[PDB]
Design a protein around this ligand. Structure first.
Ligand SMILES: [Mg+2]
Ligand SMILES: [Mg+2]
Ligand SMILES: [Mg+2]
Ligand SMILES: [Mg+2]
Ligand SMILES: [Mg+2]
Ligand SMILES: [Mg+2]
Ligand SMILES: [Mg+2]
Ligand SMILES: [Mg+2]
Ligand SMILES: [Mg+2]
Ligand SMILES: [Mg+2]
Ligand SMILES: [Mg+2]
Ligand SMILES: [Mg+2]
Ligand SMILES: [Mg+2]
Ligand SMILES: [Mg+2]
Ligand SMILES: [Mg+2]
Ligand SMILES: [Mg+2]
Ligand SMILES: [Mg+2]
Ligand SMILES: [Mg+2]
Ligand SMILES: [Mg+2]
Ligand SMILES: [Mg+2]
Ligand SMILES: [Mg+2]
Ligand SMILES: [Mg+2]
Ligand SMILES: [Mg+2]
Ligand SMILES: [Mg+2]
Ligand SMILES: [Mg+2]
Ligand SMILES: [Mg+2]
Ligand SMILES: [Mg+2]
Ligand SMILES: [Mg+2]
Ligand SMILES: [Mg+2]
Ligand SMILES: [Mg+2]
Ligand SMILES: [Mg+2]
Lengths: 122, 80, 156, 82, 205, 129
RNA sequence: UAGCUAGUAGGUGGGGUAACGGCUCACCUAGGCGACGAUCCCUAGCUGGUCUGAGAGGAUGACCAGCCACACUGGAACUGA
RNA sequence: CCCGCAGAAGAAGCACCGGCUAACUCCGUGCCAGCAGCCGCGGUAAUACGGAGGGUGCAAGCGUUAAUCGGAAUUACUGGGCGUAAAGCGCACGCAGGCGGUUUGUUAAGUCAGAUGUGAAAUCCCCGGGCUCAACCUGGGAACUGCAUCUGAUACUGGCAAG
């Protein structure tokens, strides 16, 4: 409290811990699909959620969500990942970017097309 | 007129040298408290006449040694 | 001519023997828009009965505030349980910059231009208590001159 | 050594020169010793377009500063105007 | 950069006449003015304070034809200037060339005035100005150029103007199709059912 | 031990006012007598006196209006643990000028308004509103 | 990361630089820095400034300008103001 | 840059619509498919998933991700706490260090006032000028809240002397 005390040991701000360490201050990262599987969600909800294991260009290996209805992905697919947690699925902290290198857009979408890599329907 | 500093002799053992402390008050940049700070200077004297505890007026001069760039002007209150 | 604004409605519960009895609590605040603002709580089994009991209580229990051309006399601090409140007289044209509870109280009070900020708990009932108390404990150049035993200019 | 010359500021197609005295080795738009006038070659009518502190021009030449061809033109023009 | 959508819809949403059509008719005989646009129009929402602040800023923008980026820049400039930000904001809006030309007769609406401006039909101090948002200054003379002076739309616009209220702070010569911007309008000169304090509050939150 | 006697005076005032006491008494000192003088002259107290020679006791008669203390708040600013000095152009005004700040200048202790008008800043002893 | 330091601290004399100086050398004195953080480890070009913030502050140093360092890596010197 | 000609003729997309937050209905599926910044939503009547109609916000852009500051008074000097929510060492002595009853003299160290030098230009800000306006460029001011020196003030802190 005392000024004297602060003069001896200045106030020292806590360093913010990041929520996306595998990206290391990169908006997106590239990575190869090691395995593509489905995992059960947390106890409150219930579903079969599509995830993938991904080895990144920087050595890190992380789990990533594959959003959308339907995907054509397999081992040795190079994909782009972005930040973004899934909450009800522990370990998954990155979101696969649809529309990227080997991520196809979701079929037959009309709303939120830009979030799922879907060309403009003629 | 010559710029000069006043301080006290913390060690006079060296031959023809002395170390003087020119302690000063400075407002703390962040917390406003006025804090004592000390600056130790190697000063040149002839005859090594300055005793520890003396208050001495010193001046800046050309390099006189690896670490001495100040010389003595005069002793103030040579009593110790 | 009185102006009335509903600040918050809340659903409470009493859990009697048989189970929960639900009721509602409407915190409102009336005011004439000229140094006069009465806030009131209203607990009732139904929301309309609550808004009306609250208006009724707020209409009484009303006080006067020594405004200054639609702005405050001097900066003021307000305090109550969790909520510390602070208000400053802004120049003309800015309007009322303040939290919701304070925005409503100052609006109905007639304070046209003020800078405000709430610290700590923003619980509306205590923010309103603390803003009312802040404005009420605020004296005016003539009243301060009378208190101090001199004239106006002698303060300037 | 020390020379009086123009530094081209302004924007594309709208040159604006600041006459400055500086060490000839420094970059054209870099370190200078003193600014002493300006010269707008594209100023519209009624706008002065060219204002030179000719007394400091003198001080510096008196101390051996050279003079660009273009500032020498400006100085002769301003001396002719008035 | 320009709103090309239907007008009366904006008026219906704003629940008020926004002067977005010529005025040959009664707007209530042109649309169901009170009824809100869309299927869920008959019912009214209990609209939060943020809602009223937003809808009011939208009202002013839709009246004058200014999009958000530019309107925000107008707010920053009004705020920087001395005096009441709200009144300075309305002065700045009311000083646009499209606005002044519209309050100077030549055009039934601000859309027509804007088309006239864009199409090099208006001069200020004898120079062709072709940007709608050109800020006109006190003691200016704006005039329709000769080649555009015989356009029948402009004649009709001045007639309709003759049937509208005549704005105080501009001196308009209808014969010469020449007019003068004598002074900046005060707040008391401009309609009193445009509000400002909401707009100043909206941009501080 | 006792290391800020000016804060002590401020506190004796505030506490006697809160306790609706008619007067308060404290060991005297030139600086205290000078602050009481500025306070009295600015109308926050009735009057004051010093009594005794070897242990002079200063006595302040407090001031009330509507059975209320005239002094609403009174706080020490510059204190032994953090001296506060201000320049002429930085001189605070309390309650937007309705109150006063006591400033000690090269020409003695006076109010913020006076020192401002006289062009000399100094050490801000306390605020009174 | 609690001690660090033998050219290390100072003096005398010689040499050397455009210039003062352990810059270098021989000798003598046994010092000097360190809790107001020395030494060690990690990180890092610095500043005018930029963003944010009511302000104090926080983050930052791309472009423009001033300074420093570097030119495959590690050393050396020549010519030359 | 100006002028002439054809003809509305070549030129509108993105996100969202449970609350936070401006904007709702129907159909499809039925704790599946799926959504999600948090709280959450889906188990046959879904304003929260998918589509449609409608509306809202932006606009040659619109969203998503990454990073900083803010909100965060959530490191609090301005501007927080410590009986029970995290927090008073088990207790005491005590060197450095921080603070100091009252009076007088002196000192100009802190302090304050004034002046001089400097604080590059650019940038920020104010008043003007130039580009059809703005962006941009530019004229002149202050401001660089600092540092140094000199001359002054004795209230307060400090030093010295006497109490
Ligand atoms: Mg809190
Ligand atoms: Mg644009
Ligand atoms: Mg030698
Ligand atoms: Mg020699
Ligand atoms: Mg050296
Ligand atoms: Mg590096
Ligand atoms: Mg580097
Ligand atoms: Mg803040
Ligand atoms: Mg670069
Ligand atoms: Mg090399
Ligand atoms: Mg290479
Ligand atoms: Mg050579
Ligand atoms: Mg809503
Ligand atoms: Mg959705
Ligand atoms: Mg069904
Ligand atoms: Mg259904
Ligand atoms: Mg939603
Ligand atoms: Mg849906
Ligand atoms: Mg972000
Ligand atoms: Mg903070
Ligand atoms: Mg706390
Ligand atoms: Mg416990
Ligand atoms: Mg506990
Ligand atoms: Mg204990
Ligand atoms: Mg004392
Ligand atoms: Mg002491
Ligand atoms: Mg002094
Ligand atoms: Mg102009
Ligand atoms: Mg300029
Ligand atoms: Mg500068
Ligand atoms: Mg003394």
């Amino acid at each position: 409290a005392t000024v004297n005390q602060l003069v001896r040991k200045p106030r020292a701000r806590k360093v913010a811990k990041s929520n996306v360490p595998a990206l290391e201050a990169c908006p997106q990262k590239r990575g190869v699909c090691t395995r593509v599987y489905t995992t059960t969600p947390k106890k409150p909800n219930s579903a079969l959620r599509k995830v993938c294991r991904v080895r990144l260009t920087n050595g890190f290996e992380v789990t990533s969500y594959i959003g959308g209805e339907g995907h054509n992905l397999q081992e040795h697919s190079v994909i782009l990942i972005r930040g973004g947690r899934v909450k009800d699925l522990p370990g998954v902290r990155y979101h696969t970017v649809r529309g990227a290198l080997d991520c196809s857009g979701v079929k037959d979408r009309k709303q939120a097309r830009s979030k799922y890599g879907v060309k403009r329907p003629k | 007129k010559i710029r000069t500093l006043q301080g006290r002799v913390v060690s006079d053992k060296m031959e023809k040298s002395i170390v003087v402390a020119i302690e000063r008050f400075v407002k703390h940049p962040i917390y406003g408290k006025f804090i004592k700070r000390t600056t130790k200077l190697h000063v040149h004297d002839e005859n090594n006449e300055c005793g520890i505890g003396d208050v001495v007026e010193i001046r800046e001069c050309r390099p006189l040694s690896k670490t001495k760039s100040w010389t003595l002007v005069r002793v103030v209150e040579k009593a110790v | 001519e009185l102006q009335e604004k509903l600040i918050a409605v809340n659903r409470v519960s009493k859990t009697v023997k048989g189970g929960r009895i639900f009721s509602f609590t409407a915190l409102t605040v009336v005011g004439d828009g000229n140094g006069r603002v009465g806030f009131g709580y209203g607990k009732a089994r139904e929301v309309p009965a609550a808004i009306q009991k609250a208006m009724e209580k707020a209409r009484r229990n009303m006080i006067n505030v020594a405004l200054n051309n639609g702005t405050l006399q001097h900066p003021v601090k307000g305090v109550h349980t969790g909520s510390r409140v602070f208000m400053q007289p802004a120049s003309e044209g800015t309007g009322i910059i303040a939290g919701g509870a304070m925005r409503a109280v100052l609006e109905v009070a007639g304070v046209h231009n003020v800078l405000a900020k709430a610290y700590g708990s923003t619980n509306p009932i205590n923010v309103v208590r603390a803003t009312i108390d802040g404005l009420e404990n605020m004296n005016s150049p003539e009243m301060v001159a009378a208190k101090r035993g001199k004239s106006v200019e002698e303060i300037l | 050594m020390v020379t009086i010359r123009l530094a081209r500021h302004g924007a594309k197609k709208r040159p604006f020169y600041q006459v400055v005295v500086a060490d000839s080795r420094n970059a054209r738009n870099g370190r200078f010793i003193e600014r002493v006038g300006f010269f707008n070659p594209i100023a519209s009518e009624k706008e002065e377009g060219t204002r030179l502190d000719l007394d400091r021009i003198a001080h510096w030449v008196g101390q051996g500063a050279t003079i660009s061809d273009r500032v020498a033109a400006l100085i002769k023009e301003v001396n002719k105007a008035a | 950069a320009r709103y090309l959508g239907p007008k009366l819809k904006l008026s219906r949403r704003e629940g008020t006449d926004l002067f977005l059509k010529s005025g040959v008719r009664a707007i209530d005989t042109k649309c169901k003015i009170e009824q809100a646009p869309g299927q869920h129009g008959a019912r009214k929402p209990r609209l939060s304070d943020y809602g009223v602040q937003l809808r009011e800023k939208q009202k002013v923008r839709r009246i004058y034809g200014v999009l958000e980026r530019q309107f925000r820049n107008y707010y920053k400039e009004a705020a920087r200037l001395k005096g009441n930000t709200g009144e300075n904001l309305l002065a700045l809006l009311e000083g646009r060339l499209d606005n002044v030309v519209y309050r100077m007769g030549f055009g039934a609406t601000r859309a027509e005035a804007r088309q006239l401006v864009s199409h090099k039909a208006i001069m200020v101090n004898g120079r062709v100005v072709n940007i709608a948002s050109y800020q006109v200054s006190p003691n200016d003379v704006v005039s329709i150029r000769e080649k555009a002076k015989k356009q029948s739309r402009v004649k009709a616009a001045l007639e309709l103007a003759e049937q509208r209220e005549k704005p105080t702070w501009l001196e308009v010569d209808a014969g010469k199709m020449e007019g003068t911007f004598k002074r900046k309008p005060e707040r008391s000169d401009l309609s009193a059912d445009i509000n400002e304090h909401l707009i100043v509050e909206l941009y501080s939150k | 031990s006792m290391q800020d006697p000016i804060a002590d005076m401020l506190t004796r005032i505030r506490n006697g006012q809160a306790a609706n006491k008619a007067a308060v008494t404290m060991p005297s000192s030139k600086l205290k007598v000078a602050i009481a003088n500025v306070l009295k002259e600015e109308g926050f107290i009735e009057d004051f006196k010093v009594e005794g020679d070897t242990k002079p006791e200063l006595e302040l008669t407090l001031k009330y209006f509507q059975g209320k203390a005239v002094v609403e708040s009174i706080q020490r600013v510059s204190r032994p643990g953090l001296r506060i000095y201000k320049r002429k152009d930085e001189l605070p005004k309390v309650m937007a000028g309705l109150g006063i700040a006591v400033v000690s200048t090269s020409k003695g202790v006076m109010t913020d308004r006076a020192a401002r008008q006289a062009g000399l800043g100094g050490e801000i002893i306390c605020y009174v509103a």
